[PDB]
Write a protein that binds this ligand. Sequence first.
Ligand SMILES: Nc1nc2c(c(=O)[nH]1)N(C=O)[C@@H](CNc1ccc(C(=O)N[C@@H](CCC(=O)O)C(=O)O)cc1)CN2
Ligand SMILES: Nc1nc2c(c(=O)[nH]1)N(C=O)[C@@H](CNc1ccc(C(=O)N[C@@H](CCC(=O)O)C(=O)O)cc1)CN2
Ligand SMILES: Cc1ncc(COP(=O)(O)O)c(CNCC(=O)O)c1O
Ligand SMILES: Cc1ncc(COP(=O)(O)O)c(CNCC(=O)O)c1O
Ligand SMILES: Cc1ncc(COP(=O)(O)O)c(CNCC(=O)O)c1O
Ligand SMILES: Cc1ncc(COP(=O)(O)O)c(CNCC(=O)O)c1O
Lengths: 469, 472, 473, 470
Amino acid sequence: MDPVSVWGNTPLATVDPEIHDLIEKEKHRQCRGIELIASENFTSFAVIEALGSALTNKYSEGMPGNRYYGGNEFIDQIENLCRSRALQAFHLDAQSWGVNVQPYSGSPANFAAYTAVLNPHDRIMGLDLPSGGHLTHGYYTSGGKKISATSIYFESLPYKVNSTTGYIDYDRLEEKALDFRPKLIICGGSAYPRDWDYKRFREIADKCGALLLCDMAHTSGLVAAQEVNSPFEYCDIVTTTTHKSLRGPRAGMIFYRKGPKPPKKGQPENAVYDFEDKINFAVFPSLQGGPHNHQIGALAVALKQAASPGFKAYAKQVKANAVALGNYLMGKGYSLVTGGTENHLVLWDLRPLGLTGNKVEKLCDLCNITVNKNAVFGDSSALAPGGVRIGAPAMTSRGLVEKDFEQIGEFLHRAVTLTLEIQKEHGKLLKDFNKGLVNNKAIEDLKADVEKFSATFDMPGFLVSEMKY
Amino acid sequence: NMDPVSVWGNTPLATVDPEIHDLIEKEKHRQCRGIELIASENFTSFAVIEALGSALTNKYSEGMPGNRYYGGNEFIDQIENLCRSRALQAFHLDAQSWGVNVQPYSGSPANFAAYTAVLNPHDRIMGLDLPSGGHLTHGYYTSGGKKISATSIYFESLPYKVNSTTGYIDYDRLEEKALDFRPKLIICGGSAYPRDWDYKRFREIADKCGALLLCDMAHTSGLVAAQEVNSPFEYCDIVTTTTHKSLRGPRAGMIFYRKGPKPPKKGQPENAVYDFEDKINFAVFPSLQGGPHNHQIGALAVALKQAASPGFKAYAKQVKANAVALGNYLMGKGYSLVTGGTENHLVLWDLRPLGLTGNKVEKLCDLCNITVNKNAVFGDSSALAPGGVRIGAPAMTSRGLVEKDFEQIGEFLHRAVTLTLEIQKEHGKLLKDFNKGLVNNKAIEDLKADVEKFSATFDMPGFLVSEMKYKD
Amino acid sequence: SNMDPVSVWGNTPLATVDPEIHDLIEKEKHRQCRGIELIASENFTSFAVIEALGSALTNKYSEGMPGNRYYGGNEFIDQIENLCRSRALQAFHLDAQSWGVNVQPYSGSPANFAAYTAVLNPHDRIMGLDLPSGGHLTHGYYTSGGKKISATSIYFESLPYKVNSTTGYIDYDRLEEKALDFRPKLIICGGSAYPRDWDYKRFREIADKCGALLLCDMAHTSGLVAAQEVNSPFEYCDIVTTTTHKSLRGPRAGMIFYRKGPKPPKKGQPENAVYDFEDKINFAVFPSLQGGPHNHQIGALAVALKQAASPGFKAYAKQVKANAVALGNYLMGKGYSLVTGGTENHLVLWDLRPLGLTGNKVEKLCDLCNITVNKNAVFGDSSALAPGGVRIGAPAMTSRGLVEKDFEQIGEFLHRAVTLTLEIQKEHGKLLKDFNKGLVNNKAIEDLKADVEKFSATFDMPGFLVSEMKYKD
Amino acid sequence: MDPVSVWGNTPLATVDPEIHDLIEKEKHRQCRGIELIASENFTSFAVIEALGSALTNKYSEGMPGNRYYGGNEFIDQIENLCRSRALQAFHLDAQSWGVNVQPYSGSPANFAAYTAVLNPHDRIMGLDLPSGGHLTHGYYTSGGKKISATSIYFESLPYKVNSTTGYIDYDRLEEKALDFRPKLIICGGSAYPRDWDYKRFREIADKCGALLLCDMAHTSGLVAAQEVNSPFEYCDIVTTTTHKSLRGPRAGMIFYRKGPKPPKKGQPENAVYDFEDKINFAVFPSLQGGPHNHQIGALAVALKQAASPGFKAYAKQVKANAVALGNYLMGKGYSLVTGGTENHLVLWDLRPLGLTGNKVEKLCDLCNITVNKNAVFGDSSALAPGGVRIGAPAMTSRGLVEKDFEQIGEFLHRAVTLTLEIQKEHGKLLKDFNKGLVNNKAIEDLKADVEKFSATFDMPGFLVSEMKYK
Ligand SMILES: Nc1nc2c(c(=O)[nH]1)N(C=O)[C@@H](CNc1ccc(C(=O)N[C@@H](CCC(=O)O)C(=O)O)cc1)CN2
Ligand SMILES: Nc1nc2c(c(=O)[nH]1)N(C=O)[C@@H](CNc1ccc(C(=O)N[C@@H](CCC(=O)O)C(=O)O)cc1)CN2
Ligand SMILES: Cc1ncc(COP(=O)(O)O)c(CNCC(=O)O)c1O
Ligand SMILES: Cc1ncc(COP(=O)(O)O)c(CNCC(=O)O)c1O
Ligand SMILES: Cc1ncc(COP(=O)(O)O)c(CNCC(=O)O)c1O
Ligand SMILES: Cc1ncc(COP(=O)(O)O)c(CNCC(=O)O)c1O
């Protein structure tokens, strides 16, 4: 065999220079560009140290103090600490709320949450994907093609935003819920630029007999910082990712109510919530196997970080940065969904200009401007949807303030002005528009300007001064 | 006022979070000061860990390489491409005949994705019964009818069993059951089965009943990569696996699927090609998962390189030799091993002839720094107090232990079980009474000290012991 | 310990084998011709139909299709079933290369469940008219409280469409909107208490927009359809189901019509594409859902389908519609509220809530007066026990020969019944147990029963000779 | 409009001469041949008079006293009498049993019974169709094709008879039930020639947690006459048709337990059965609409007839006739599944002779001998199965006794010998064999002998001229 030191203790740069080289290049990409994917962030080195740790070695199926394996003395303390810090980060009373921190990621957390409270084929309603909801909110297409497993194993009827204002159509939602009678109503979304009227969602849920779940994955950092409405006030269950605005590792959690139910006509006195055992069982043994304890430890670190005054100031800045970027784009005459934002992102409708989102995402990516084409209301094609989604969390984490985001706006303005000029000269068909991308001097200049701008800012997670490139 | 970036973002865990830092340091200590015998556990390499804890965690990359839903994946695509190519290479697969998806978060998501790819809800599956050695996700429901795995809720499961006396898979009963039940999918591979699999026979059975054949090689994938056990790829349509067990990688999953022309079947169009790739990819994303965890994928690409090396082959040989040597020691003491030995990395130990349940042995061992898990054995209904303990060699073999060290582990386990027997005789079989013997017990203290001394004489992969906070 | 002679058990009349059942049937015969039968789904079928219904045809097992049976001995059963199917196509003026029919469903609800089983997998999506809006149980009925009632809401995923709250007409825009979000595999039209005709053309437009199959359940108006007195669903629907005992005036049975031959031009469908319903629908009926056909029903149905094709039957269906209108006009001449303010078919749906009444009260008092109706849900109802309406149909009494002025008398009898219901309620309270107290020893109920009976006995009765009947007064 | 008397009172022979002629030809066919379909019977004129009556005109959804329509004063009394005569015919205590008599037929009864106690995709086990079970007992084929909706809306795992004895393999049933964990186990069958160990079925159901349902459709008449084991002693639910050995109209019935549950380790004290409301709801409003009241009335007549001493003697004779036919066939060296019968039918395995049942059924049909081809153990083809099923109820109703059924045995022996000869001349292929079914002198002679034989017997189901006084 090989001595332990050789295969087991040698650094990555020697054991696997090919992968090491690719990681170093990805590290250089991350701080040499403008990273505007609304679901991305740059997590802390401390989170990354817990992530890449011996915690990966441990099997710990079960719950702390009730495991299927020996050896979990410290894994249990880690998971317990993570759970308690999660309640604290979101200002929850442990007698009123519990949390499962084992979901591998956001989509597993939602599927487990649904499995906990729903039987196969029970009805759900979530925000329609083109209106800003997530895949796992029951997404099938307007052509009736079932995409998400949440529209396969359950019966989805999505609700939509107002086609002209972009705000959730609460009236239609209530009418729909009353006809369809969902077992579960989901709120929260992936590309909705406004806050959520959780009070109205509760009102509606109560009127049709549904459970109410909020998926706060995108805004969970703003929620912890109390910079947006808290779903916990009104929802039975709250799921979330931990890697977005929360700035943690890639993981999920499922919060659930505990204790006495609020008085409701038709329900016994002393009625208590009964989510905890079902939610735990749905994560394990129903759906997952071994928890990823390096994720839980990393999560515990990020949850402590999210409770700090500094994180709260970061969340304020994210919102202020998104507003300042949005105001810049509208000041150039561009069209934002709902005409502004209340959170970390803006949804920018490109159809009034003539372009689809893949065109500007492709050109932007050539300029080290990382966005993602994103569905907008009415869209039927995931290849060429009508908009781009831009978020502030990632570059806010690198220290940027409003003026820097106005310069980001300026770069996007240039990128889109180039996009239209390439379209007005080489056509609207895709491959014909690709022609204007090869050896484009204005792209190279925009790229050079973007790299120059990006390199002026700090980078969490790792030392620029030690990276290979 | 926002924190300066370095203050929250560039400072070490030791400073940002002393509590978690200390707990990770205690766990690192616990990992090298005991004997780790959980068959599904391993100690992965520092190189794997360096990729796992990396900026790769920052990137959203839904889709496939070259077909993503986000910009910025120039290097993610190369890493995932590399990871998939090394996966095929590790298992000696022709890329015209096999593809792989390396995005599943873990083994259970890999299986549920593979099922979702090829099955509609409520379709029929057949896997090894859990008390016979099969995994949760192979359709586990209890002998009392209680649906446990979601793979028994969203699909219709009919488990097959081992022979009640011999402990080997009853292939005749499996075929008879399969022909009556008519499953869409037959699953092989196990979690607590100590023998190799007659995959050729599984193929014949699957052909007779029209079923797909999937092997879950999570436990033995390391031995398969080293060609130390039967390869499921010769006969199975689909192979799922985890990567953190005998394969010694990160925690992740992998789905392998055939590609290219299908073999001849009467009633098949000629020039018929497999059609798994698109379905399997689609099942993983956008059907079930969201963003890949690229730090896992990167770490996996590193582990797959390490598993394709001569030293890993010799590791896999040693793992098997250690399990055998340990099984022989235990059996020499009169202990019952299911199937009377092993052909892989684990032994399944039936404690019932001793008048013991595995939770008692597990608890006592844990106090002695011997880390095992209680395990169901044939006929068990209690997951709380099943009739067995399961012992594996991958983890301690990765620390450099050879047969004589595993005979020593056999003796420690012998002492552990003898002690458990003594506690029970003094205080009683009830768990509340038995626990009364676990407190201030000098022989537990003594066995623990002996285990810690033995365990401390071996190297540890993954981190430098000279660097750890708790060296004593 | 000996076997009875065959004739003793097997050839003796009901009147001697079973005096108690014979007497009860004689009392039901008396009941049927001595009151006013206004249940919209009831009719009085012919003696000829009844003679086929009670026949040796009941003795035969004939699973399968004519010429492809699982039993021998079907030489004549095959000819009867073929004649029934061909007469079914002819009664609805269907080209046999464009339409086929299955005449084995035991009744209307089996017919629908089979039609759905043929074209749907379990949990597939369906949209039918909401029951309080006029749709049938088997059209996906679950309550506004979310309780699944019909198995069609258990084995399939239902989303009902509704009428406009104020007008009572189907809200076609809301249906289209709902269909586009819900994406049903099947849209159902036809109803049980919808008093207007159906815009089948619009249903086809909606169904094509969402890629759904389109099925019409014409159970209630099938007689009016055969007579070409209402819109024909066959122009626009893929599948048409129906009972045969309602306005069609036959036995209790069901039928499933389905298209055959080339499919009309649709972008995305291959050229030379043909319908593929026949095998699927037959298989759903048998072996999937039913066992042996009820050949006495099929024979009787064959008789009814011949009778439905006659000039006299078309005149019947015109008189049914004229009678319903005359009755509706009389009722709203008194200020009563009919849903949609009138009718285009055989029934009216009478919303009693503006009177402060529920249908179960009116139904109970009517029954005591020999006026046979049924309480019936109206828009917004949640209670099947005490719904807000009563439904009145013309088919049964029209079959006894009643014309418009007779139906205006019926309206007056109904007006008197509702007035008495109001007085009993005013005097005895609105709670059911208190209202019931006013139904005992009530002279006006006695008087109205007497007037109804004397009116009722002035008309003929199909199905049996009143001159042979045991209870002639 | 036609006067009422023209369209509505004129007899069938004038309104519709075509259908009248076909019915008359069918009556002639029924009394001129030998009717051996085990599921067929000749019902009484009294039953038929109730079936063809003004009861067909009434809508009566709901239960007696709780209808969705007015006017049910007398339909309620008819249905109540039907239900109580159903309990009486099967010697059931009304405190311990209820019955729903609205199922349109046997298959509707079973699907409703299952819908009452099962959720979609719940697990059931019934006797495999080639082993003798019914379509509605979860039938999918050995090639895995779902055939019955009971294998589509529910999850079926059939249990089989012993391959070599033809008797149900109870040990394998138990083993299967323990592995599969069905919610419902069904017993009773369509082509099983032996009685059922209901005691063992109860033991197996108690052991795996399942409800136990008997579909007694084929033997219900023998059950009412207490000539076979009663399923009611051990089963939670008993479904049945009424038109087979029970000699009634085509209808279904669902019996269900009521009252205190028998002592069971785990069940709370004072536990009561809770089937009634669920069974009623499953029939209506879940699955059916309006009851067919003319069937309910005709059923009430048949149930009174089934309670009689003469019907008990009929049931004895059915069983004696099946035994005598079975012994005659075996005496010719033919193979019967299980080597005999304990009920009304014999299942005849034609494979040892190189024959499939469709050939025998076709030939027999040409000779006015009405049988049905029938699957036997191992069969995959429904078109050309391995056997023929022969039943005694119908001929017995015409007064035939053991010697008459031995002559039937001889006609069957002649028919099969004649089939084994048309297959030497013409070949095993259907289209080939089929050529010998035209201008066959032996077929013609056999048909004439069968005719002469059948014409010597009485026939129920028309009115006797002397009784034209009442
Ligand atoms: N053969 C085999 N052994 C194995 C596993 C496996 O999948 N297969 N496991 C990992 O792969 C662990 C055991 N996984 C299990 C998880 C839940 C239950 C179970 O029956 N849970 C019920 C009862 C709980 C109780 O009794 O306290 C429940 O959760 O309610 C059994 C085994 C370790 N050993
Ligand atoms: N054991 C048993 N015998 C019985 C019946 C039964 O239900 N069970 N039957 C009454 O209860 C009749 C047979 N009923 C059957 C109906 C359909 C199929 C069947 O498998 N049909 C397929 C194959 C068609 C073909 O091969 O041509 C199909 O319809 O697609 C089999 C038997 C008479 N004998
Ligand atoms: C055969 C098999 N398949 C899949 C899994 C699941 O892997 P994850 O825990 O990553 O989901 C396991 C885990 N079994 C763990 C054990 O046997 O102890 C397994 O044994
Ligand atoms: C609202 C929401 N919920 C759950 C998830 C799932 O997280 P995972 O990818 O870890 O499964 C996402 C991810 N959406 C990513 C994006 O909006 O770009 C999300 O936006
Ligand atoms: C056991 C059994 N159960 C139910 C039925 C169905 O009855 P209906 O055909 O009325 O739906 C049958 C009919 N089997 C007919 C035969 O054996 O020939 C049956 O044999
Ligand atoms: C539209 C419609 N479809 C099907 C049926 C069912 O017929 P059966 O009862 O034979 O199952 C009805 C009966 N409804 C009766 C009524 O409206 O009063 C109906 O109105």
